[PDB]
Amino acid sequence: SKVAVIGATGRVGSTAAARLALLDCVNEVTLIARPKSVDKLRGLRRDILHSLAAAQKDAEITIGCERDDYVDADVIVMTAGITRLDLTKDNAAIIKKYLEGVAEENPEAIVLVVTNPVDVLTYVALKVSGLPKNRVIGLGTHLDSMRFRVLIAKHFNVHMSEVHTRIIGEHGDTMVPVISSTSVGGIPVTRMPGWEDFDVEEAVREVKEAGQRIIETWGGTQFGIAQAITNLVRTILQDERRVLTVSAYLDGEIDGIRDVCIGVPARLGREGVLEIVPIELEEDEMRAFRRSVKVVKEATREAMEAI
Amino acid sequence: SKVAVIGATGRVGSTAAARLALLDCVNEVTLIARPKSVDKLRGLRRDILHSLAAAQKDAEITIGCERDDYVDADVIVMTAGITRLDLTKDNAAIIKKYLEGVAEENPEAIVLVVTNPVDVLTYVALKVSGLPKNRVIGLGTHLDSMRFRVLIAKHFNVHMSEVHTRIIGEHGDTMVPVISSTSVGGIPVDVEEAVREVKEAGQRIIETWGQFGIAQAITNLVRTILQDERRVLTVSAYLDGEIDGIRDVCIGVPARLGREGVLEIVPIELEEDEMRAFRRSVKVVKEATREAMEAIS
Amino acid sequence: SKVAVIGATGRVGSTAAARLALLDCVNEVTLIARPKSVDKLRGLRRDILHSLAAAQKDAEITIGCERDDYVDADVIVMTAGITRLDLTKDNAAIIKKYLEGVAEENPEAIVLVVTNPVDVLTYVALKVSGLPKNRVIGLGTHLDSMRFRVLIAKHFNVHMSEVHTRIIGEHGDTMVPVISSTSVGGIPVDVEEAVREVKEAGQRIIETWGQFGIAQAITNLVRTILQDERRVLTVSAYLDGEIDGIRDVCIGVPARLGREGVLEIVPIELEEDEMRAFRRSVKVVKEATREAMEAIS
Amino acid sequence: SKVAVIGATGRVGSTAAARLALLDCVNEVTLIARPKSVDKLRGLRRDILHSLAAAQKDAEITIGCERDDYVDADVIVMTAGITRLDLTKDNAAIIKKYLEGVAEENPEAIVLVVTNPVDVLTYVALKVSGLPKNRVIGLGTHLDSMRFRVLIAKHFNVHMSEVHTRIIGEHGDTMVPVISSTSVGGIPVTRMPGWEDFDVEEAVREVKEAGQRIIETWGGTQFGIAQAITNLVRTILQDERRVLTVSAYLDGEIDGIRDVCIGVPARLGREGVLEIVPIELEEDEMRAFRRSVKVVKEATREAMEAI
Ligand SMILES: NC(=O)C1=CN([C@@H]2O[C@H](COP(=O)(O)OP(=O)(O)OC[C@H]3O[C@@H](n4cnc5c(N)ncnc54)[C@H](OP(=O)(O)O)[C@@H]3O)[C@@H](O)[C@H]2O)C=CC1
Ligand SMILES: NC(=O)C1=CN([C@@H]2O[C@H](COP(=O)(O)OP(=O)(O)OC[C@H]3O[C@@H](n4cnc5c(N)ncnc54)[C@H](OP(=O)(O)O)[C@@H]3O)[C@@H](O)[C@H]2O)C=CC1
Ligand SMILES: NC(=O)C1=CN([C@@H]2O[C@H](COP(=O)(O)OP(=O)(O)OC[C@H]3O[C@@H](n4cnc5c(N)ncnc54)[C@H](OP(=O)(O)O)[C@@H]3O)[C@@H](O)[C@H]2O)C=CC1
Ligand SMILES: NC(=O)C1=CN([C@@H]2O[C@H](COP(=O)(O)OP(=O)(O)OC[C@H]3O[C@@H](n4cnc5c(N)ncnc54)[C@H](OP(=O)(O)O)[C@@H]3O)[C@@H](O)[C@H]2O)C=CC1
Ligand SMILES: [Cl-]
Ligand SMILES: [Cl-]
Ligand code: NA
Ligand code: NA
Ligand code: NA
Numbered sequence A, D: 001s002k003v004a005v006i007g008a009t010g011r012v013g014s015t016a017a018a019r020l021a022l023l024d025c026v027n028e029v030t031l032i033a034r035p036k037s038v039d040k041l042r043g044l045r046r047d048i049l050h051s052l053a054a055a056q057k058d059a060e061i062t063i064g065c066e067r068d069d070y071v072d073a074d075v076i077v078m079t080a081g082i083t084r085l086d087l088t089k090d091n092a093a094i095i096k097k098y099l100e101g102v103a104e105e106n107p108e109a110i111v112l113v114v115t116n117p118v119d120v121l122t123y124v125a126l127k128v129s130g131l132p133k134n135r136v137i138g139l140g141t142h143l144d145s146m147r148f149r150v151l152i153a154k155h156f157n158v159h160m161s162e163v164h165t166r167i168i169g170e171h172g173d174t175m176v177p178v179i180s181s182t183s184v185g186g187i188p189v190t191r192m193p194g195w196e197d198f199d200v201e202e203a204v205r206e207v208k209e210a211g212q213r214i215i216e217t218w219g220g221t222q223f224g225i226a227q228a229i230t231n232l233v234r235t236i237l238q239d240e241r242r243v244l245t246v247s248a249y250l251d252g253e254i255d256g257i258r259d260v261c262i263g264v265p266a267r268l269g270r271e272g273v274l275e276i277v278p279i280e281l282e283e284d285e286m287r288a289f290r291r292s293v294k295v296v297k298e299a300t301r302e303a304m305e306a307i
Numbered sequence B, C: 001s002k003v004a005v006i007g008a009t010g011r012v013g014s015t016a017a018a019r020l021a022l023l024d025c026v027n028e029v030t031l032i033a034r035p036k037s038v039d040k041l042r043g044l045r046r047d048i049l050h051s052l053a054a055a056q057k058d059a060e061i062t063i064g065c066e067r068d069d070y071v072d073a074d075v076i077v078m079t080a081g082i083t084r085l086d087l088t089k090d091n092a093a094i095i096k097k098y099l100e101g102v103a104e105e106n107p108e109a110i111v112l113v114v115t116n117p118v119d120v121l122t123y124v125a126l127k128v129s130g131l132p133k134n135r136v137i138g139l140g141t142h143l144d145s146m147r148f149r150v151l152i153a154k155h156f157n158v159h160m161s162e163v164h165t166r167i168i169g170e171h172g173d174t175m176v177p178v179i180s181s182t183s184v185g186g187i188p189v190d191v192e193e194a195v196r197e198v199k200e201a202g203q204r205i206i207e208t209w210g211q212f213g214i215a216q217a218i219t220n221l222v223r224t225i226l227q228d229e230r231r232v233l234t235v236s237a238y239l240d241g242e243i244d245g246i247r248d249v250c251i252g253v254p255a256r257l258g259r260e261g262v263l264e265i266v267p268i269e270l271e272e273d274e275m276r277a278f279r280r281s282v283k284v285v286k287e288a289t290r291e292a293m294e295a296i297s
């Protein structure tokens, strides 16, 4: 299995590439950046190789800058990225530059979009690549859900892995926390002693702002997004067939909603999205999801016009 | 167990702290930096926590800038650092600021020095801290041997785990590769060029990329200590006569490492040339150590 | 950390000891049995050590028959055991023989009772040992819920990890399945037949095979404790008013478990019928506990 | 991946089956025993399933007693077994009963022989199955090597995984410890401080007798052999291509020796034995190997006559 990380010189891409190489299911990581960043990629390659020696693990680490260097990858991770609309237009052009026509040379490629705005760009990437709708996903609200898990786990003083929760919708201000799917040890939080003392609304506000707040303090998410990328790639390559909240193309599975890429619970395996789990949302949760799809659809239309 | 990472905002410290927190044996990581770095520490804490959530792992992450924030740690990882002698002088003063008198408040602390020149600064840390000689180690030539291992596994086109090499002495230009204890597939094995590359590799990666290798090496060492694994690792350690009667120096040697730190220096049999090279390396390191100690006096 | 397994020569004890030794957090396993079982203990020790070597793992394995061989363990796993009341009487006397006064010599010991009737014998162990109420637990209805989980995952043809159920109360015929806290894929969900199977499953497997399930459950509990993981697990624990004001009984309840043992009984909200069933189960368990305590007096 | 354990009701087979089910690379374990042991297999299946729930792992667990129940397995583990010659004859008949002609219905099967005498029966199984020479191996001296590792690790007070050693030849009294391949942390033991204080000959004597000594105390190896089986199956199914000492058919790779199955270092992967590593043996070590091949060859001839 070959995984190509486009934007491997960035904070996100370098850290993702280093953690992906440690996966037993990843036999090659290809580091892709623009031609002028070649020396940075050479240093990163050496450093990743050194981490692999320390971990007594194996991976071939290659570098490149052209379509032929990564088109044949099993998974292509798009982390390259630079006014919200102007940013979307600039990053949509990057998507197109790298992913246009991939389906023709590698119809079996799986693309994971990380570049923001991730829901819009997942749709762009899907359309320009020509790949099947199930083979292009975005990170979406998976990391937002993990950030919500942290806050909940800390409140109940439980191991973070004991908390199961889901946030769906836009990777942004219209994200929808799904309390009806939130549990501590399988126990619905509404039945947990102390859930009354948890300020859900403040937590959601913290999650919505965590990205820019981390950007203004540390300089941007790095280890969290790298581990989330690693978790998704592993789920795919090992064909684990587990449900994760990712930005995926909708074709009528939820509330008849169609023609958009947005964060939803999807079972993922070696062939990509195996199914959009139809999620049993409470009335107010379904309403919020609808408001979120509307925003993402309008933004998606603008980006498609631009390209 | 609590692990404090001093210099947690740097390239080495942040990556080490993030990988350390993933260890099941590490219940708490404390990120230490200077007062003006508080904002960075807070963002780093949030990002590491999110990474643990995504890994199905868990840890308490705290932050601080003051002695009382880290002195009670089980392991203190010193990665903070800024002419070679001017550099040694300034980094020695950083070690002294953070580690002087630690044994008075936490006699059972273990210190892992990563700041360079690491062999010199392991001795500095040992002396200022007051800790027993087995409780202060440095990460030195093991980093050099990891790179050498990568070259050997490539030559023989073998798995990484099938190559086992060892470099002792100074983490620097007097490093001693021990070909005597270098095997491929369990069987004893242009070395001069490979060594030349190994010596230059750190500045080579510095001039290109600017991390992950050192961070993973730190993680393996702390894990070996906290799980009392008793592995024979190459670390910078205080010598007290076990090898060739050599005393009063911290330098890269094979050492059996466990929860009590250095359980024993392992005196591997060296060919005559390997021993002579080690003795030269000790001389260099002793001289640099005397300068650093006199500078912080 | 040291884990002692009392009854290490039995089907449960030997398998538990072997799986416990594989844990990175377990540095030493002590196998305890009766004097006449010394030869078996020695063969078991060698076989577990070989299994660790084959797993690239490591542990110190010791053996004994006497109090001083295990009383200083961090965790003591009680699996030794031989009319229902006659059985309770004889197993209670075994608990008393091995665990009476442990708190006097090792106040920080944690006891995990597996011997049946486990809810009764958890109380017996707590009282004879003198240990604080949070340091003695039993493995009870969790075993019943594992089997229930297998039935649910089969019905919905889903992954095991996607099913989360919970059975509280007596590890026996008054067990209370908590459908309120049973989810599939994160979403809240012939139950009467499934329960009937669950209740009979232990005698069903006894009448066919004669182990691995209980051993793995024991391993998860000890790991949660020694790595201070703070997980909400169903264990037999002493109640002191957290659920419905109920006091002075050991019974299966949700509990946040860590290095200090039971950190808190978690009072999950029960539907009215679930609460009534729990109260009936407590009554049964209290009666059996009073008989056992009077029998060992 | 489907793994069938023949003799799953025994001490070896039950424990192997339980640990194999925990492997992520094992999706099905089929428990095979004689028809009259069906109720024992039903209880074992339930117990393994219960351990999988405790570990939050998945495996389908099936049971059977006929050729069609296991012939299609990816790996067939033969642990069923009952005067050394009379034992060999009886266990050779068991081998033949279960493995004759497997190549015709499943030419891609891999067989792991555990039944003793393992070197002889690996050859029997190879010949009766009709499978390619690289697809039938025996446990051989792999467990003897692990027992030697224990003794060495204890002497140096090091983690057992720090010790690398190899024993080759017969799984029996003519086994050959290969000190020239024995190291502590990559450091040859002859260069370790204290190797002079290690009584190699007593250690070897302990290894040679550990089997019967464990049989007379605990009742026979159980967890050790089960973990060694699990390690070999994982190496194969995950195509790890690592060198392990197993009983494998020799065709001239070592000292021109041919036409025997005996413990040797073999690189193992998804296609079975990828290569018999030609081992650089010291003079006295090569001599001992030769004496060992002679014993195993004579015993093999007797067993083939019998069947
Ligand atoms: N999904 C999520 O939740 C998150 C999304 N992101 C998104 O991921 C992307 C990467 O972020 P991050 O790595 O921190 O950013 P950095 O600025 O640290 O790295 C940028 C990366 O993009 C590449 N790049 C930038 N501009 C171009 C261009 N015009 N053409 C080709 N490559 C280009 C850079 O290559 P070079 O070395 O040549 O400059 C480098 O690899 C961003 O779009 C960001 O918004 C990040 C954080 C969270
Ligand atoms: N063992 C080895 O071979 C290797 C070790 N190293 C050594 O580790 C050290 C850190 O390198 P690296 O992280 O890459 O450097 P960075 O510049 O990326 O980070 C420097 C770190 O040191 C801290 N620091 C710098 N000056 C001082 C000071 N005067 N007082 C206190 N803290 C200070 C910084 O804190 P702040 O954010 O406040 O500036 C920050 O945590 C160096 O000594 C380096 O040589 C690195 C690579 C390999
Ligand atoms: N929590 C649960 O639901 C389950 C728990 N259990 C319980 O665990 C216990 C052990 O069962 P299991 O291992 O299968 O039984 P086995 O017969 O296989 O083993 C019995 C064990 O108990 C020891 N033992 C028996 N009698 C005495 C005694 N009078 N004094 C001291 N030690 C004694 C034996 O030691 P020796 O070798 O000297 O005889 C041996 O270690 C039982 O109480 C059983 O009910 C078992 C299964 C499930
Ligand atoms: N490679 C090594 O180092 C080791 C090899 N072994 C060998 O592995 C084999 C199994 O040992 P172990 O499990 O401890 O023995 P057990 O007696 O505990 O189990 C025997 C197993 O073989 C089956 N069996 C026995 N006779 C026959 C027969 N005539 N036809 C079909 N199946 C039969 C039994 O099935 P049923 O329930 O129907 O009786 C059961 O599954 C032995 O040959 C033993 O020598 C074991 C230990 C170490
Ligand atoms: Cl990292
Ligand atoms: Cl087991
Ligand atoms: Na890899
Ligand atoms: Na941790
Ligand atoms: Na262990």
Ligand code: NA
Pocket (backbone or CB within 6 Å): D020, D021, D022, D023, D024, D025, D026, D027, D057, D058, D059
């Ligand atoms: Na499995």
